[PDB]
Design an enzyme around this catalytic site. Structure first.
Site, PDB file in Angstrom:
ATOM      1  CG  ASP A  35      -1.824   1.180   1.315  1.00 46.81           C
ATOM      2  OD1 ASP A  35      -1.957   1.899   0.309  1.00 46.81           O
ATOM      3  OD2 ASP A  35      -2.416   1.378   2.401  1.00 46.81           O
ATOM      4  CB  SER A 199      -2.076  14.261 -13.495  1.00 48.79           C
ATOM      5  OG  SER A 199      -2.482  14.027 -14.832  1.00 48.79           O
TER       6      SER A 199
END
Length: 330
Positions: A35, A199
């Site tokens: 994770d 992004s």
């Protein structure tokens, strides 16, 4: 040194991935959910409330000659999905795909929430976010990667998750045969403890690319792709009959649909998520309404590039003094 381990979807939907991890001496192999959005290595154990164990493999520290109770240490964690666990702490030897750390904090669960009990395939979590998020008290502990870093050939690990197929986590090296073209690196903020990046935009299907900054985390422990409501609405608008269902808890679409791809930007580079990656199947057994793999982050407080996004790429988690993230197509 290096390590290399295969990671395998837990079910036909790729709801999560498990990776075998050797703990203790002699080894006790548990299947952990790696994770990158948390920083505790915790396991079902011989100490876990018996009624809360249902099919998981447990770690029994009393059977490990290298286990040592970390005196006074406790841990307690709550995840973004509302699940939780808590317990005490041992140090022991932990190996992943040939890479060994001695003195790793292994957090032994005394209590786990129902979501964990109900998932027989996940024996615990191995956190790979920054150690500043580790919940051990009163002395915070380091992640497996943090402990291994100095010994690694290069201070990196990579995630190569498969679509409906096994993939690989590598530690200490970049497998140049595992991706196409070049790896594009992008800046990371560690201020929240996550692999947080920005992004450069998105496209829906064969649509034009929208240049826009989208801050979010690279999170292998989250199944879906959670993005701003504007972006998500633009996506689902291209699917006939798709709608946001408050009763179901997100966007659903007719199972008879063909889903468009979704592209996200990494600098000037582009990662394409095929439409099929966005299908999470019937909302309930036998339903013709299917659950979408792109969902709104509104009310999460952060955008999350979960498995839906990451599995479309070869992803480098670069733990150099100034961390960065790399993405390649594959």
């Amino acid at each position: 040194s290096t390590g290399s381990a295969t990671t395998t979807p837990i079910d036909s939907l790729d709801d999560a991935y498990i990776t075998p991890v050797q703990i203790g001496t002699p080894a006790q192999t548990l299947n952990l959910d790696f994770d990158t959005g948390s920083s505790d290595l915790w396991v079902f154990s011989s100490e876990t409330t018996a009624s809360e164990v249902d099919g998981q493999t447990i770690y029994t520290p009393s059977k490990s000659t290298t286990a040592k109770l970390l005196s006074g240490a406790t841990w307690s964690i709550s995840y973004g999905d509302g699940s939780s666990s808590s317990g005490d702490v041992y140090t022991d030897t932990v190996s992943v795909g040939g890479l060994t750390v001695t003195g790793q904090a292994v957090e032994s669960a005394k209590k786990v929430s129902s979501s964990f009990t109900e998932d027989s395939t996940i024996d615990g979590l191995l956190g790979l976010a920054f150690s500043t998020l580790n919940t051990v008290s009163p002395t915070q502990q380091k992640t497996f990667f943090d402990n291994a870093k100095a010994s690694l050939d290069s201070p990196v690990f990579t995630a190569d998750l498969g679509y409906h197929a096994p993939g690989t986590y590598n530690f200490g090296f970049i497998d140049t045969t595992a991706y196409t073209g070049s790896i594009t690196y992008t800046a990371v903020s560690t201020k929240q403890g996550f692999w947080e990046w920005t992004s450069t935009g998105y496209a829906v299907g064969s649509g034009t690319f929208k240049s826009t900054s989208i801050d979010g985390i690279a999170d292998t422990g989250t199944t879906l792709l959670y993005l701003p409501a504007t972006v998500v609405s633009a996506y689902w608008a291209q699917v006939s009959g798709a709608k946001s269902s408050s009763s179901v808890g997100g966007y659903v679409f007719p199972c008879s649909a063909t889903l468009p791809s979704f592209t996200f930007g990494v600098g000037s580079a582009r990662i394409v998520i095929p439409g099929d990656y966005i299908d999470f199947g019937p909302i309930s057994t036998g339903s013709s309404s299917c659950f979408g793999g792109i969902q709104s982050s509104a009310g999460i407080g952060i955008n999350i590039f979960g498995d839906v996004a990451l599995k479309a790429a070869f992803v480098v988690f670069n733990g150099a003094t100034t961390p960065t993230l790399g993405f390649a197509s594959k």
